[PDB]
Write a protein that binds this ligand. Sequence first.
Ligand SMILES: N[C@@H](CCC(=O)N[C@@H](CSCc1ccc([N+](=O)[O-])cc1)C(=O)NCC(=O)O)C(=O)O
Ligand SMILES: N[C@@H](CCC(=O)N[C@@H](CSCc1ccc([N+](=O)[O-])cc1)C(=O)NCC(=O)O)C(=O)O
Lengths: 209, 209
Amino acid sequence: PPYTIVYFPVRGRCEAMRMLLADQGQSWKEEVVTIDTWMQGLLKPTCLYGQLPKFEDGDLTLYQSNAILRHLGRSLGLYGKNQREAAQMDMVNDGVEDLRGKYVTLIYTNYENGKNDYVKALPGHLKPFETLLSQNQGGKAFIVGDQISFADYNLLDLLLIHQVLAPGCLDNFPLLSAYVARLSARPKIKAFLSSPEHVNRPINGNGKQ
Amino acid sequence: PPYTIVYFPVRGRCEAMRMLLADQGQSWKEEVVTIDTWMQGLLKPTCLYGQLPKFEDGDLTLYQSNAILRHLGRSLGLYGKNQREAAQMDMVNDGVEDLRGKYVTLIYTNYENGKNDYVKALPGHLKPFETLLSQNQGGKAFIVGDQISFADYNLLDLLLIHQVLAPGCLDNFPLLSAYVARLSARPKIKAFLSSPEHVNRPINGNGKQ
Ligand SMILES: N[C@@H](CCC(=O)N[C@@H](CSCc1ccc([N+](=O)[O-])cc1)C(=O)NCC(=O)O)C(=O)O
Ligand SMILES: N[C@@H](CCC(=O)N[C@@H](CSCc1ccc([N+](=O)[O-])cc1)C(=O)NCC(=O)O)C(=O)O
């Protein structure tokens, strides 16, 4: 510490880590970068890959949203209790990323014509997560193990944004519906989901949701 | 152990882990699944996400190529010496994945028309890796730290396949050119790169390279 998040004035690839820090009683400094500030002309600070977000933990600067999640997962003890749980948590997080990549592609490159085809193929992509829950204590606890991990926060966010995209996409998935209701019920998270800084902030950076 | 890899008869998303195991004196069992075997019916829905590869370490089954790399990175001690190096190794591996995703998109969905545009934008994507090397002992050692990690194996593979795609794409990058020559010089890897099981195996699953 201290923690600092540099990103656009949207949820996107930072709402997951913002939920993690908030649930673990942590506090961070929000540093906004408008699209005007980003793209305008000759301006280049030191963006490794040229994109955002950028995280700062004490005197450690990091890039890549998932690399940041795994960092907080190691330092804050949210990466399982053994090798098996660690590997399974990566397998799950990667699956979440694959679907998140598709969602981003839809919103930014083919929202109008692709929406119908996306929502139609969606139940096929959400099914694996449903299967994972049943295999672990009947989906009573978390995606992997007994305690909450970084994978749970990323998965929760993926499902929350898909409920806005497709209103009843979880109806055919009992476990996933209860899983979202359960994790949202947690006092720390609930406070965040009902916070002005979260509500007033749009999901994506183009008005499409 | 024992180690087992289930995948298509191509390099693709498994040549990196095959180099890692080979360099660490490990031995695995190769289990091939033809495209014909893929299209069947009842004997098919057994894959978590519905894709490959599938790795087996003793009595631990895993999916997602990157999750498998990180697993071998923890058990075989190829994940750095501290938190900083671990986070930086993830940041690098994720960058490699982003470019690998683009490469796969080109080869399978737009090889004919997209090739020229890809090769033209390529030097902009390889630049970050060049910058990383100079920042670490002038690119004398490895991508991160003093010892070889899983990130190095994945990066080496990404560059090797891009040299086939675009013959002189590394000419403008001194450090990356020496980095590939150095890691390829390693006796264990060199033996693998000159092995029949590797040579006779095509890079992608559609004849395009
Ligand atoms: N693999 C990377 C991808 C990072 C990424 O997508 N970065 C985007 C922001 S997320 C998507 C996004 C982009 C822009 C806005 N906006 O409001 O302007 C909102 C959301 C970016 O920097 N875009 C600008 C650029 O490429 O130069 C990661 O996970 O960190
Ligand atoms: N994010 C995942 C992606 C896995 C993946 O790309 N799986 C592909 C194989 S790699 C690319 C590939 C595909 C097919 C062949 N082939 O010879 O038929 C070769 C390579 C697959 O299962 N494709 C079939 C399907 O989607 O059902 C990971 O890294 O594991």
